Amino acid sequence: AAPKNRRSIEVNRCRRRNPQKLIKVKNNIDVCPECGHLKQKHILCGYCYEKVRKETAEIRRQMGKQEGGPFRAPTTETVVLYSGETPSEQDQGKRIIERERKRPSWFTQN
Amino acid sequence: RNRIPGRQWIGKHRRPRPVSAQAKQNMIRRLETEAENQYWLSR
Amino acid sequence: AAMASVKLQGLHKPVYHQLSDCGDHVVIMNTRHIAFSGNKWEQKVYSSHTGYPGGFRQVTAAQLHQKDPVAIVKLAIYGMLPKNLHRRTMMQRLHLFPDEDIPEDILKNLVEELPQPRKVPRRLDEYTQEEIEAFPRVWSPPEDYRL
Amino acid sequence: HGKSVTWWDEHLSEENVPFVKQLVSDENKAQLASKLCPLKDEPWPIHPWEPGSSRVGLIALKLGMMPLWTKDGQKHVVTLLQVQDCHVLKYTPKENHNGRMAALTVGGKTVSHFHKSASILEFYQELGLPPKQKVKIFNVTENAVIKPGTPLYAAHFRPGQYVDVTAKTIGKGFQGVMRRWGFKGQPATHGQTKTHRRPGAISTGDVARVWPGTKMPGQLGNIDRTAFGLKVWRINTKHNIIYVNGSVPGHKNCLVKIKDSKLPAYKDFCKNLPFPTYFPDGDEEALPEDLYDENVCQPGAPSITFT
Amino acid sequence: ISHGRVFRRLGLGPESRIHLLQNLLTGLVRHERIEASWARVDELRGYAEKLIDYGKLGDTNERAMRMADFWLTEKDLIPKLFQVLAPRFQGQNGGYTRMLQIPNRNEQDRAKMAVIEYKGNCLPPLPLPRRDSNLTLLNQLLQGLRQDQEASS
Amino acid sequence: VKCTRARRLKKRSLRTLWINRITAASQEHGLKYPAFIINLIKCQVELNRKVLADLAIYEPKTFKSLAALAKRRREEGFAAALGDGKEPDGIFSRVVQHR
Amino acid sequence: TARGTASRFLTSVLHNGLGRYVQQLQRLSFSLSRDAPSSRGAREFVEREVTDFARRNPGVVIYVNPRPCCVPRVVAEYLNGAVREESIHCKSVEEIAALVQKLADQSGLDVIRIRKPFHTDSPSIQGQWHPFTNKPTTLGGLRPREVQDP
RNA sequence: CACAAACGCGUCUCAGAGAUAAUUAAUGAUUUAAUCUUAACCUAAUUAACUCAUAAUAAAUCCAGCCCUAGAACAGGGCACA
RNA sequence: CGAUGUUGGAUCAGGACACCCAAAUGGUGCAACCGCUAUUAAAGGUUCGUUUGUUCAACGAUUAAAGUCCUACGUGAUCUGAG
RNA sequence: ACUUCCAAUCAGUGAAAUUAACCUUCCCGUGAAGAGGCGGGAAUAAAAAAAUAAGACGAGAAGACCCUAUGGAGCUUUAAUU
RNA sequence: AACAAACUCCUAGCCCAAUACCGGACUAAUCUAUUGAAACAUAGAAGCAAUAAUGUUAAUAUGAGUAACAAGAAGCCUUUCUC
Ligand SMILES: [K+]
Ligand SMILES: [K+]
Ligand SMILES: [K+]
Ligand SMILES: [K+]
Ligand SMILES: [K+]
Ligand SMILES: [Mg+2]
Ligand SMILES: [Mg+2]
Ligand SMILES: [Mg+2]
Ligand SMILES: [Mg+2]
C-alpha cells in the first residue's frame, strides 16, 4: 500500500510529541554513600564495582603466573595476602597469592 | 429507499411535484391584470 | 415544543444574536399526560439504529411513551432546534419531569408560567347544572320510545 | 519537590525487619479471632424467610478438580472451592444502590498491608480487619441484611442446592481469529500462498465500510463470565470446602464469586436453608465433618451392587 | 500462550540452550565470579545451585561423576568441585550463590548485566547494598516499640 | 471571492436579524410581527426595520407606544369590516395627504 | 479582507467638534526638486497655490525644502501624532490641490475598517431592555407554584 | 503430550414476564332483529421479533525492584505468616 | 481505455420476503393419515459424496428443510487459475 | 502441541513506490448516472502503540483487448510499378 | 397578510456579466540616446513577466525514525571451551 496524501506538520507534531513517546524521568537515582557518585537503588554502584573489578583482574593475573599450564587448577582453597602480612594458622594448607600493594581498605581480612 | 429514476425533472418519469395554493393565486393575479390589459386596447 | 424551542434559543429577547450565549431554561411538567392529535399514537414511529448489523429498531409512539415517559417531548424539541453545535448546549437547559414531582431547587428558580397552547375541552360531567339548563333542547323525543 | 519513590523495606534495618513482620502478623490473628462471635456482638435483627428473598453469597478460592460417583453408577467431576477469609465489609441502603434491592459488600482472602493504597488501608482500619484481595457487590433484599464484619463459612451452602459461579476466565492474550471465534481456515497445500489462518473477506463491496459487529483478532479470555445451574454435592466443614458440579470459570488458585442460582427453576429454594446465613454460635451443636448429597457414594460406603 | 513455562528460549534452540549454560557454568566454577547478561545469569543460577547438591553426594557416586562430567567441559575442574566447592558448602542448604544487577554494559547493545558468584570466594567483596543502621531515626522509633512490647509480654 | 459574496449577503443577514428582534419585542406585547408592520404603515409612520430594532432594545417605553398604536389601528380596521362599510374612517385611520 | 486587517470604532480625537472645531492637521513638508522633470507638478503647485492655501488654513505650517530628489513627497503630521507619507510624483497641478485639500479634512486617525457607522455615549435613554422590563408583577412576588407562608 | 502447560476426540452449563400479525369468540348501536366494533366501554383465545425482570462490571490518587496460571508495548494480580 | 482486473470454487458473510423448514390460521372434491391452496411471521437453520473448470443438470445416501434473489451476477491491496 | 528465522520492547545505522490542499465520520436522497466534502437528518474531548484489508472508482505501467490515424513495420501472393 | 433576487426605486458615483476570435487604453523589470543623482522623466530597442507541459537542474519534505541490516560464550585479553 502507498500513502494517499502528504501528512501535514500539524498532525506530525501531535504524533511525534505524544506523552507516550517522550522520555520518562527516573526517580530512583541516589548518591553512593561510599564514593559519593550516582547510582540507582536496585543497581550496584558503577564506580565501586569498577574499583573491585580492577583489583580482581590483578589478583587473577597473579594466579595465572603461578599456574603455567592451561589445565592446572588448585585442589585446595585460595587465600590472597598483600604486603606486610603473613599466613595465619587457619590459612595454612592453602595456596598463597602475593601482592606488592598495600591491602585495600574495602577488602577485609578474616 | 424510493428513488426517482434518472434525472428528477426530465424524461418519461418525473417528480410528482404538485401545484400549491400560492401558485394558483399568482396565476389569478396575472390573469386579472391581463383581463384589464385587453379592455383598454379595445376602443 | 414550538413555544419551548423559542425560549431555549432566546428568540423572544430583542437582544437576540446567535453568537451571543443568550438562552433561558424551560421546565416542563406533566409530560406523561400529553395528548397526541388524531391516530398518531399508533401511526407515528420513532426509529433508530444501534450500528451493529440487524440492529434497526422501530418503536411505535404508544410503545415509546410507555417505556420512557419524557422521550416523546424531548425528541420533538430535539428536532426543532437549529442543527448547529449549540443544540447540544441548549438542550442541557431543558428540564423534563413525568409528573408534578419537582425538586425544591428547581422550583425556587422559576419566574413565570407560560400559558397552555391548547384549550382543554371539558367533559360532560364537568358542566354545571346551570350550563345544562341554559343550553336549549334541540328536539323533542317521542314518549313511547325506549332508550 | 521531586520526592523519590520508597517502599516499606527501604529504610528498615536488619534488626527490625523481622520485628515489623511479627507486629503485623499478630494484629491479623487478634482481629480475625475477635470477629468469631457474630451473635454475641449485638447483631442486626433477623427476620423469617419470605417468598422472593435473596441471600448473601461468598468469595472462595478454586483449588482443583476431583472425580465423584453417584449411586446410579454415573461419574461426575466436582471442583473444590475453598472459603479462606470471608467477611461482609459494608452495607448500602436500598435507595442508594439500585432502588430495588440493598447491596452487601464481601471481601476476599487476606493480603499484606504493605502493598495497598492509603484509602484501602484506612477503610479496613476503621472496621478492624486485614486487607482483602478481591471485593464484590452482592444484591440482597432488605429482609436478609447482615451486619458488616460478620464472618461467613462454607456451611452457608447446604448440599443439594444449585449455585452460580462468576470469575475472570483464563486469559489467552492476543489470539488470532481462528482461535478466538472459530473460523475455518484455508487449505494448507493446494497452492495457497501466505493464507492459512486469516479471516478472509470481512465485508461487502457496496457498503464500503466495516460493520461495528465484525469479528476481528483481539484480546481473548481475560473477561468476567458466569456459570449457571451448578449443583452442590458435598460440603466440608473444618476446611470450609465447597464441591460444585461441572467446571467453573477461572484458573487455579483464583477467587470465585459464589451465589444462589437465579434460574427460574431454582426459585424459592432457600426456605430449607440457613437465613440470612449460617451462624455456628447460635446452633450450639457440632455439624458433621462432611455433608453429603443423598445420591453421592460416600468413600466409606459398601461397593455398588446392582442386585 | 506461555503459561507455566519456567524455562527461557536462548541461543539456536533447546540444545544450544544447554551448551550456552554449559560454558557459563564452567566459567563460574573455575573463576568463582563471572558477569553475563541478566537473563542468562538468572538461568545459570538454577543449575549452579543444584550442581553443588551433586557435589555433596561424593566422589564415589557414579551419577554425580557423570553429571559433573557433562557440565564441567574442562576436565581439570572435576577434582576442584569434589574437593574444594563441595567440602566448603556443608552448612547451608540453598544459599550457595549471589546474584546482583551490574549496571548496563558500556557498549552499543546496552544489555542488562548481572554478576554471579559463589559464597566465600577468594576475591574482594562486591559492594553489597547495606541496610540502614539501627541508629537511624526511624529505626530508633521502632526499637522503642520492641523494648516496650518485650517489657510487658 | 468570498469577500464580495458575503458583502452582498451582509445586507440580507442584518435585515433578517432586525426582523427577529422586532418580532421578539412585538410578541412581548401580544402582537405578531405581520400585524405590527401593516397596521403601522396605515398610520403613515415610515420607520425602517433598522431603527425599529434599536427602539425595541434601547427604548422599551417608546416601542410600547408604537405597539399600542399598531394594535389600536388594527382594531379600527376590523370595526369597519364588521360594519356596513359606510362608517367614517377611524380617528387614527384618517389619511392625511401633503400637497 | 476584514479578517486580515485590524479594526477600530468610530472615534473623534479629543471629542472634537463638540465644543469647538479644531483643524487636526498640524504641518506639511514638501520635498521637491528644481531640475527633475517628475517634480513639475510640485513646482507649479508651490508657485501658485501654496501662498493661497496658507491664508485659508492658518493652523498649519508649510515647509518647502527643494533638494535633489527623484520622487517628490509630502509629509502630513496630525495632532494625535499620526504621520502620513504621500507621493506627488508626476501629478497635475489640480491633482496636487485635491490631494492636499483631502489631507486637511482628515481627523488623523488610522484608515482601517470601521466596525459601526455610528458612535454614541449613554444611548440607553428612558431605560434599556432587560428580561424584567415587560413582565407584570404578581401579588407578593410569588413564584408560579409557590405556597403562601400563612 | 520428553516443561510445571496448552489442546479435542473429552467434561460442564444454557432461563422467567410483558407485548403482538392473520384469525377465533363474547356484549352491542347506527338499522330497538341480527352483526367480533377504521361504533363506544369491558373482556377472552392467540406467530416470531422486540422490550424488560434478572445477572455481569463497581474501592479515585503503595508501586523502585522481583514473581505471575496477567501480558506485544503500556496496563493488571501478588511480595505479613510461604 | 495517462487501466473500474474478468468465470467458478475456499474463507467471512450483510440484506430483502415473492418463505424451503420451524410457529399460528382460513378453505377444500378436508372422516383420520398423507395432501392441495390462501392469509400472517425473516430471530435462527437450510447436509455429505461420483462425473464435468464448471454455475446449471443427472445420479447415490440422508435431513425438520437441503428456499428464490440482491449485494461491482458481494468478497483476487485475503487465497486459488482448472476454464 | 513444541522449536528456529520473522515478530513486539531496548541500543546503533537508516531506504522505496506515493503525496493539489486537508481541520480526512455514518445513513438516505441528489448529482458526469457508485459522495469523508452537495441536500435532509444522525453521531461527535484530543492524541499514541498493536492488529484485520470493505472503501479512498487504492499504488504501479500515457490499456496489451476494441476502434480511429489518407501514423509504422514483419510475413505471403493471383495487388500496382520494376 | 408577511418574509423573500444580479430585478426596480432611495443617497453618492469612476454609470451595467461572460468562453473561441477580434479591438482599445495602461504597465512591472532590463539596456541605450539625453535628462535625472536618497532612483527618475520623454523617447528608441528586445533572451520584455510562469499557481499548471507524468516539464529540466539543484535543494527540501511526506511515507518514517517505519521496511531492513550485524558481533558464538567466559576470562588472567587474547588463552581455554561450544559448534
Ligand atoms: K427521469
Ligand atoms: K353492522
Ligand atoms: K477502461
Ligand atoms: K435468513
Ligand atoms: K481496506
Ligand atoms: Mg439520478
Ligand atoms: Mg414535473
Ligand atoms: Mg496469559
Ligand atoms: Mg484447516
Ligand SMILES: [Mg+2]
Ligand atoms: Mg507468489
Ligand SMILES: [Mg+2]
Ligand atoms: Mg503456505
Ligand SMILES: [Mg+2]
Ligand atoms: Mg457509505
Ligand SMILES: [Mg+2]
Ligand atoms: Mg491487546
Ligand SMILES: [Mg+2]
Ligand atoms: Mg514464563
Ligand SMILES: [Mg+2]
Ligand atoms: Mg534469539
Ligand SMILES: [Mg+2]
Ligand atoms: Mg527466574
Ligand SMILES: [Mg+2]
Ligand atoms: Mg340488538
Ligand SMILES: [Mg+2]
Ligand atoms: Mg436491562
Ligand SMILES: [Mg+2]
Ligand atoms: Mg498492582
Ligand SMILES: [Mg+2]
Ligand atoms: Mg488515474
Ligand SMILES: [Mg+2]
Ligand atoms: Mg461464495
Ligand SMILES: [Mg+2]
Ligand atoms: Mg446471512
Ligand SMILES: [Mg+2]
Ligand atoms: Mg408474507
Ligand SMILES: [Mg+2]
Ligand atoms: Mg411450517
Ligand SMILES: [Mg+2]
Ligand atoms: Mg465477482
